[PDB]
């Protein structure tokens, strides 16, 4: 097309580096916790065209798509695409995020340890679960 | 402690029908299919064990072979010995294992420690 003057070559979202020369769907896919499918859905609900690139974005669009991806339920994202449906503690329909994935797998591992179930002990030994 | 936005006392006081949406799909299907006689006797033995105990002392263990059980909220604090085919193990039922089976609390196989191989 043309040369965009306001081009962000490297983005930093949720303490995660994003390659700005990649397409918006797959650059958002590049961070942990969201793949191509949820990126396509969150982009279709954000009223943003798919063709334009990640560094070829304005700041309001970036902050609003972050706002969409933070609270899916308020923005009419149905309750089957979400990573965790029914939490053990509070049972809330919510996305998990990048550091949230590490912390949540850590606490799931810890509760499986303290319950002393078969799966937690198998993870403790470090063998195949399924 | 809080399970699915609901604390332990409410779950113990919660009626029998609305546990069919607060469990996982496997447990909801199992509870829909209906429980049979042996673990009904197990549950009554759990009740007789929990009432006939000192308030400060731990209630006495009941030994069983039934690892088919889903854990109900009535079974928290219970002292249950579970068979794994060879020996019983002594399990105190904490209330964070409510969405589990007893079969994962008695592993039926030892972990593998590989030794030096022979003539293969």
């Amino acid at each position: 097309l043309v040369i965009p003057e306001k081009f962000q070559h490297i983005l930093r979202v949720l303490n995660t580096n994003i390659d700005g020369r990649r397409k918006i769907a797959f650059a958002i896919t590049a961070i942990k916790g969201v793949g191509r499918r949820y990126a396509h859905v969150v982009l279709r609900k954000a009223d943003i065209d798919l063709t334009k690139r990640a560094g070829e974005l304005t700041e309001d669009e970036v902050e609003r798509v972050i706002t969409i991806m933070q609270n899916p339920r308020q923005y009419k994202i149905p309750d089957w695409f979400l990573n965790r449906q029914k939490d053990v503690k509070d049972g809330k329909y919510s996305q998990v995020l990048a550091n949230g994935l590490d912390n949540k797998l850590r606490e799931d591992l810890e509760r499986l340890k303290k319950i002393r179930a078969h799966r937690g002990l198998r993870h403790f030994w470090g063998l195949r679960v399924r | 402690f809080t399970y699915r936005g609901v604390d332990l006392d409410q779950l113990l006081d919660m009626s029998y029908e609305q546990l069919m949406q607060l469990y996982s799909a496997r447990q909801r299907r199992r509870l829909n299919r209906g429980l049979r006689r042996k673990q009904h006797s197990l549950l009554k033995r759990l009740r007789k064990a929990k009432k006939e105990a000192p308030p400060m002392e731990k209630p006495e263990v009941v030994k069983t072979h039934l690892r088919d059980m889903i854990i109900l909220p009535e079974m928290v604090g219970s002292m249950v010995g579970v068979y794994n085919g060879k020996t019983f193990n002594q399990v105190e039922i904490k209330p964070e294992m409510i969405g589990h089976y007893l079969g994962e609390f008695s592993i039926t196989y030892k972990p593998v420690k590989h030794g030096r191989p022979g003539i293969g």
Partner: peptide, 14 residues
Amino acid sequence: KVPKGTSSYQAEWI
């Protein structure tokens, strides 16, 4: 260290 009630068959897992 061993818990109070666990059997040796399960104590091998710990």
